Symmetry: C2
Subunit: 134 residues, 2 copies
């Protein structure tokens, strides 16, 4: 039995969570480059945790690296097909690129993935507004 690199190497998910807290805080402080390097490491250690690909993609987007962010969100979307944040942040990147039709498609996808789920109240609103602007 082996699924992730961290599991194979007996790195506990508690070590990963401490590294995620560090990366998350670096991101919130505006240290996008430093956070991106911890998120690279976390993505290699556990390539099934959506938060690590959301974070890598958020650092890239913050640095204006829209295509690289979309790559992280494209992997996340195939790895976790019900997670609306992937198509949602991809659409944010596509808007910065001026690709309104593509952005709209992803926003409709995010909407279908959040329907009737109580956890996504705030995001539901964010998505409505954005489509309307478009």
């Amino acid at each position: 039995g082996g699924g992730t690199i961290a599991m194979l190497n007996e790195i506990s998910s508690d070590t990963l969570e401490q590294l995620y807290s560090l990366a998350f805080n670096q991101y919130q402080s505006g240290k996008y480059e430093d956070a991106h390097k911890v998120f690279q490491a976390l993505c290699v250690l556990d390539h099934y945790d959506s938060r690590f690909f959301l974070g890598l993609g958020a650092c890239r987007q913050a640095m204006g690296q829209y295509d690289l962010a979309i790559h992280s969100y494209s992997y996340g979307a195939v790895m976790d097909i019900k997670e609306p944040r992937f198509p949602f942040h991809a659409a944010e990147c596509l808007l910065q690129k001026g690709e309104l039709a593509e952005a709209e498609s992803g926003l409709f996808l995010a909407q279908e993935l959040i329907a009737n789920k109580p956890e996504f109240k705030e995001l539901s609103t964010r998505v409505s507004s954005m489509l309307e602007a478009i």
Copy 2:
């Protein structure tokens, strides 16, 4: 950005290099100096996984294990470290230190002779040379007592 935006920038964002790991390495190192051995161990262990050819990471992992009294586990890390960098005398020296805790005198002595060979005439290692000679003498005397 301080990363710019060319060929090298995109490459840096897509690959793990030693540069990717440097701040995590400084963190683990600082934690070790503060005596936060359990925290430093987590970070060094992740670093060893991310680059299992970097002797610096096995030195730190070994040192944290040694500081926590985990003598067998420290020796695994230090011996692997010596495969990666056979000219680093700290590996055989620290392993010798752990071997003595295990009651393995002959094994500790072989480790100290290698450290001694590695540090001959290196002004950098004058203090370590002094400790090594002291320990070798102590081993011999204990055995002859």
